Design a protein around this ligand. Structure first.
Ligand SMILES: Nc1nc2c(ncn2[C@H]2C[C@H](O)[C@@H](COP(=O)(O)OP(=O)(O)OP(=O)(O)O)O2)c(=O)[nH]1
Ligand SMILES: [Ca+2]
Ligand SMILES: [Ca+2]
Ligand SMILES: [Ca+2]
Ligand SMILES: [Ca+2]
Ligand SMILES: [Cl-]
Ligand SMILES: [Zn+2]
Ligand SMILES: [Zn+2]
Length: 575
């Protein structure tokens, strides 16, 4: 549908018209036309095909607006919008849309102060320039500052794990609204994409307009950006940008599919529907006018002749073909994970004692946890020395002797030197239960030198896992450049697993490289890189990444029980 695109065009025309001082009657009309298009559920094109008079049946649409709708549908543009855009720069439009600014203020700011961008606006805010204008006091100034921050965040993405728990807190409040029967966090978050834009929630309600009203008045809500009969966009006090859509309970499953996407996956499903005489919309699966499915997501897939497809697969990257042939991949599931294979302690830079790690693992129902403290070069420190590392192995063994399961694996995260040698000697490595190796320095070696360094590390016969291989930090450091085919092939041949480190700003291996590694036949190790017990919750992110990468429980170290894991670690591995 082009409804939302057209709603935006009319809204912008309204904003620009007011900036330019057009008739307030015309300004208000464009905003009413925008609301009508925003609220309209049926495709605008379907009413336009019925003619100009039918378009005029819509609330707010007169002869002028009807011709513009037809113009948009026939040409893809609206000349008036193009005309006003010539008079109103992109930066000034951005300024006027900041909550608390608006078009007439933006005009004064443009003419009088020279503000034609968010940049100048922020400069003016920060210096107190705006305080010398009428109608500007602390309440409005604060609204504008915050509005600017929300504007500047709108294109950007955050790590999934930075926002998932916050999104779930909002989900609890949405579910608790009287009138809401079911709700779910959808969009790219439900697909476990490692960075997310806005957050999208679907609600089932028989009273959708009233559900929207309850939603926008939740204690968590700071600013309402858009609101209508069945949808809203808000910003929370905590800064999260959130879209809500409401559907009737009979449509909930179709709404879940719609709001989860991806867009590419939904395109595939809509074609499959029409090819068998059905229509898939947000509201259901229909044969002619008859709704034949919609209440549950599995029912919707079934009506299209498909098994239910897990959200992390919904990227149009082979899952539709696999579903059509009744051969969806087996996927790793969170209950199959028997432990976390990279956690840190007070022996190095973790906050927790062995007792505290053990207690947390026991709560989680794990069989084991690998305590993998850093070698000295990781910490940019003097220790722990090789002698201390071995003393620690004995202490972890005594801890197991006195505690029992979940068993602690005595491990280390061993730095790879620039030349590919390792930061502990083999007499330490041979005694560790679990040897991880990783890059923590010289991130910008030429690709061929970084590759040689990693290959040399993988030659050491005591290594078990290549930890967080790219070393990326979301928002801070790009992945290292290396020939991952060469690295992964050597790891496979040597029997070294690659890690999916689900720590929220690592997410490393990323899904795409994990998909490559698993497809090449490697073993996989999941971890959270925990430095406090609250980080252990990130295992779900590592599992979601595995699902996106089509990874099953086969060749995942964490699905082995303790005895089988120790056997794997001690075995002659590789070719
Ligand atoms: N990208 C996109 N998605 C659409 C469109 N129409 C419907 N959808 C559905 C499928 C999307 O997964 C879902 C949510 O839209 P969003 O734009 O919020 O995208 P999504 O959450 O998938 O990714 P994001 O992390 O927000 O970039 O809505 C469209 O025109 N574009
Ligand atoms: Ca009308
Ligand atoms: Ca409720
Ligand atoms: Ca989204
Ligand atoms: Ca959205
Ligand atoms: Cl469902
Ligand atoms: Zn650390
Ligand atoms: Zn590390």
């Amino acid at each position: 549908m082009r409804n939302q695109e057209l709603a935006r065009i009319f809204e912008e025309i309204g904003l620009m018209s007011e900036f330019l001082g057009d008739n307030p009657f015309r300004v208000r009309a464009y905003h009413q036309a925008a609301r009508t298009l925003y609220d309209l559920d049926t495709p605008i094109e379907e009413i336009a095909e019925k003619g100009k008079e039918a378009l005029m049946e819509l609330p707010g649409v007169g002869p002028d607006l009807a011709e513009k709708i037809l113009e948009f549908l026939r040409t893809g543009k609206v000349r008036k919008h193009e005309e006003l855009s010539r008079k109103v720069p992109r930066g000034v439009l951005e300024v006027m849309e900041v909550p608390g600014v608006g078009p007439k203020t933006a005009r004064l700011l443009y003419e009088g102060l020279g503000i034609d961008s968010l940049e100048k606006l922020k400069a003016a805010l920060d210096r107190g320039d705006l305080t010398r204008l009428k109608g500007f006091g602390p309440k409005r100034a604060e609204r504008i500052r915050e509005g600017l921050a929300l504007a500047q965040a709108a294109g950007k993405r955050r790590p999934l794990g930075a926002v998932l728990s916050l999104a779930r807190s909002l989900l609890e409040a949405i579910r608790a609204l009287p009138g809401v029967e079911r709700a779910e966090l959808c969009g790219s978050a439900r697909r476990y994409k490692d960075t997310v834009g806005d957050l999208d929630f679907l609600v089932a309600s028989r009273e959708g307009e009233r559900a929207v009203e309850g939603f926008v008045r939740l204690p968590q809500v700071k600013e309402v950006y858009a609101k209508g009969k069945e949808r809203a966009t808000v910003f929370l006090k905590n800064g999260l940008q959130v879209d809500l859509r409401v559907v009737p309970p009979e449509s909930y499953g179709a709404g879940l599919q719609y709001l989860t996407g991806s867009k590419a996956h939904s395109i595939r499903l809509r074609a499959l529907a029409q090819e068998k005489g059905l229509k898939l919309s947000e509201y259901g699966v229909f044969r002619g006018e008859k709704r034949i499915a919609g209440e549950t997501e599995e029912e919707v897939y079934a009506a299209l002749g498909l098994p239910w497809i897990p959200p992390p697969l919904r990227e149009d990257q082979g899952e539709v073909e696999a579903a059509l042939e009744g051969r969806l991949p087996k996927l790793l599931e969170l209950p199959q994970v028997k432990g976390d294979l990279q956690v840190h302690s007070t022996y190095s830079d973790g906050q927790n004692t062995l007792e505290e790690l053990w207690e947390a693992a026991k709560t989680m129902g794990y069989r084991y946890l690998a305590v993998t403290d850093h070698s000295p070069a990781v910490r940019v420190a003097g220790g722990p020395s090789p002698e201390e590392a071995l003393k620690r192995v004995g202490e972890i063994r005594r801890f197991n002797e006195t505690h029992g399961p979940p068993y602690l694996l005595a491990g280390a995260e061993v730095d790879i030197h620039p030349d590919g040698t390792l930061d502990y000697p083999d007499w330490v490595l041979r005694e560790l239960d679990l040897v991880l190796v990783s890059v923590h320095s010289r991130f910008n070696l030429p690709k061929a030198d970084q590759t040689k360094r990693l290959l040399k590390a993988l030659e050491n016969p005591f290594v078990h896992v290549l930890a967080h291989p790219t070393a990326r930090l979301l928002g801070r450091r790009a992945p290292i450049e290396a020939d991952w085919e060469a690295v992964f092939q050597k790891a496979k041949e040597k029997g070294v697993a690659v890690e999916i480190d689900g720590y929220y700003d690592r997410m490393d291996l990323p899904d795409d490289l994990a998909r490559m590694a698993y497809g090449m036949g490697l073993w996989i190790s999941l971890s959270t890189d925990a430095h406090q017990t609250d980080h252990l919750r990130f295992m779900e992110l590592a599992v979601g990444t595995a699902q996106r990468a089509w990874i099953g429980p086969e060749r995942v170290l964490n699905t082995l029980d303790y005895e089988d894991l120790l056997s794997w670690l001690k075995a002659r591995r590789g070719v």
